[PDB]
Design an enzyme around this catalytic site. Structure first.
Site, PDB file in Angstrom:
ATOM      1  N   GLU A  27     -11.479   6.072   4.382  1.00  0.00           N
ATOM      2  CA  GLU A  27     -11.802   4.662   4.213  1.00  0.00           C
ATOM      3  C   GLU A  27     -11.361   3.854   5.423  1.00  0.00           C
ATOM      4  OE1 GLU A  27     -10.578   0.502   3.041  1.00  0.00           O
ATOM      5  OE2 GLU A  27      -9.502   2.210   3.894  1.00  0.00           O
TER       6      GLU A  27
ATOM      7  N   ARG B 117       2.684   0.071  -4.202  1.00  0.00           N
ATOM      8  CA  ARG B 117       1.774  -0.698  -5.042  1.00  0.00           C
ATOM      9  C   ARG B 117       2.526  -1.743  -5.856  1.00  0.00           C
ATOM     10  NH1 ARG B 117      -0.623  -4.191  -6.969  1.00  0.00           N
ATOM     11  NH2 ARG B 117      -2.368  -3.985  -8.444  1.00  0.00           N
TER      12      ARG B 117
ATOM     13  N   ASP C  15       3.423   4.491  -3.666  1.00  0.00           N
ATOM     14  CA  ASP C  15       4.549   4.122  -2.815  1.00  0.00           C
ATOM     15  C   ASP C  15       4.837   2.622  -2.849  1.00  0.00           C
ATOM     16  OD1 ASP C  15       6.585   4.106  -0.967  1.00  0.00           O
ATOM     17  OD2 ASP C  15       5.544   5.384   0.478  1.00  0.00           O
TER      18      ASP C  15
END
Length: 170
Positions: A77, A15, A13
């Site tokens: 994460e 990056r 999306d």
DNA sequence: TAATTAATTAATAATTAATTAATAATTAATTATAATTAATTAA
């Protein structure tokens, strides 16, 4: 020599749509920034890479997007970011919402309902409640909302100095 | 009616990487085969 800022975002999306110039612009203020693109998958959680820099970082700055709730790696994460933050409050978090409401992040409804509609058929019935408990508290801190018209350039300069103000003055 | 949530059922790309599948060709180099013409010699 160590990392003072650690990012986190979606894959395809943002990056190379915005997070790229923001990473580069930042290097012009003489601070070392960490961004990673390796898809990992070599196991389930890598140590010497992510786990090392997590404890080495100083200002965890996520960038929640529109489809940030689908990748099986990102959420779990993020559950390690906000969890490590609650133990030592010496560090901070400066989230930046993106093309989404600051209401679809506190209750996982709207554009995330489809996401957790299929994520509940694989994992535990408690690990999912662990994510929704961590993803919620992120959507309560301060954050620059970026609407459809706001300049993708002026925001960067304004947000960068706020990261540079907490370094020079310490 | 639209709208969305809720439970269940349902159907081609794309690389990742393992492997096998093309003598072809040219270059470098290896051995083998037929005669003709010229001169000289013996009916």
């Amino acid at each position: 020599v160590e990392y003072d800022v650690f990012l986190s975002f979606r894959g395809p999306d943002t990056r190379k749509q915005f997070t790229d110039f923001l990473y580069h612009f930042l290097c012009y203020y003489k601070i070392h920034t960490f961004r990673d693109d390796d898809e990992l998958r070599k196991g389930k959680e890598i140590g010497p890479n992510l786990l090392r820099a997590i404890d080495q970082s100083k200002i965890y700055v996520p960038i929640i997007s529109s489809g940030y709730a689908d990748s099986k790696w990102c959420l779990m994460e993020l559950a390690e970011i906000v969890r490590r933050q609650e133990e030592d409050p010496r560090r901070i978090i400066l989230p930046i919402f993106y093309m989404v409401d600051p209401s679809d992040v506190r209750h996982q409804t709207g554009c995330y309902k489809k996401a957790f509609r299929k994520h509940a058929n694989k994992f535990d019935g408690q690990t999912i409640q662990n994510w929704k408990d961590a993803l919620k508290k992120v959507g309560d801190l301060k954050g620059w909302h970026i609407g459809k018209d706001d300049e993708q350039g002026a925001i960067a300069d304004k947000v960068s100095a706020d990261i540079w103000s907490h370094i020079s003055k310490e």
